[PDB]
Write a protein that binds this ligand. Sequence first.
Ligand SMILES: NC(=O)C1=CN([C@@H]2O[C@H](COP(=O)(O)OP(=O)(O)OC[C@@H]3O[C@@H](n4cnc5c(N)ncnc54)[C@H](OP(=O)(O)O)[C@@H]3O)[C@@H](O)[C@H]2O)C=CC1
Ligand SMILES: Nc1nc2c(ncn2[C@@H]2O[C@H](COP(=O)(O)OP(=O)(O)O)[C@@H](O)[C@H]2O)c(=O)[nH]1
Length: 321
Amino acid sequence: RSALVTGITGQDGAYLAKLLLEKGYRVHGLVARRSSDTRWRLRELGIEGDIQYEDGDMADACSVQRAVIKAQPQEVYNLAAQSFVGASWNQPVTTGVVDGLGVTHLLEAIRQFSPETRFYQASTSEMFGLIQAERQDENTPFYPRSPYGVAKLYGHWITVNYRESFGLHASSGILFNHESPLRGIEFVTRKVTDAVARIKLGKQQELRLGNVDAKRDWGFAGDYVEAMWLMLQQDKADDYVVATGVTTTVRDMCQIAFEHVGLDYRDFLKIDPAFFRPAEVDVLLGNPAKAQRVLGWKPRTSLDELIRMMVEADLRRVSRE
Ligand SMILES: NC(=O)C1=CN([C@@H]2O[C@H](COP(=O)(O)OP(=O)(O)OC[C@@H]3O[C@@H](n4cnc5c(N)ncnc54)[C@H](OP(=O)(O)O)[C@@H]3O)[C@@H](O)[C@H]2O)C=CC1
Ligand SMILES: Nc1nc2c(ncn2[C@@H]2O[C@H](COP(=O)(O)OP(=O)(O)O)[C@@H](O)[C@H]2O)c(=O)[nH]1
């Protein structure tokens, strides 16, 4: 029972790897070459030594092919990506190559070497961007609002196309924002909790955010990776929206974070235009009805609980510096 997880050093890769290991999977994690060790998330989950690392890059089709061949995975989870919207306008090509073509690279590796391996594409609610429905489900028309959303949209559709064109068991998980103590510092939730922690510990004096009016459906990565796995356990591949069904403004989330340490965010929050987006996704609100009905998946961790554990995690990290 082998699984190839790209983006294994990322937030989801860590939680998914952990989940896969508990299920007896030999977990192969595709790791891009970095100048320094980037496996802290895997160590945080205590599974860094339980993964068979595959040296490769999503932009290098050959290395992706090689990793698939070496892993002989029954399941492939494509979590590798330039996953930050905030960087997609600066590097729209790498975003498209990695998040879009990278999917094709994996699908091709699968199609040409082991068409039976099940594939999971890490699609995103960002694809709904300018939401065409108050609550977005699998049938809500997509409307990407960033090179990231567009690249992912490509990733989503190419996955669907390979499923439909070759009968590949390829599924696109349209996951809405999910955070955790492993959430990248680039994302608003981790940025906030990290700031709250440093502010609380007197190592920081302010928190600079952009659009605090943006509404996000935030879930726990730990819960979401379960949906990914469940998706690949289905006999027939399909796409599913995975979300909490609850959307919150960055402001309130920010308030939740500071309040958790007895602070008033208003005392440190500073709106900085440098963090505004060229084309904003004002609100995301997912409808995971299909996932609950078919996968039996449902979110367990609420935003409050999520922010709490993140703040706690960052308080521990900051206090250890
Ligand atoms: N988290 C969310 O809220 C949402 C995320 N997603 C998507 O699901 C996936 C997992 O998200 P999450 O864990 O937060 O993402 P992260 O950004 O935390 O981690 C995934 C990344 O993939 C690796 N990666 C990036 N570029 C390449 C490359 N060219 N070749 C190989 N590996 C690469 C990164 O390594 P390195 O760090 O060294 O670059 C890192 O592991 C991503 O595809 C993301 O876009 C979908 C919906 C929502
Ligand atoms: N990353 C980030 N987002 C911010 C910031 N200030 C406000 N936001 C907004 O909060 C939302 C969530 O951003 P992010 O966590 O990056 O996830 P996204 O949903 O993938 O864009 C968006 O609408 C951002 O524009 C900030 O400093 N950083």
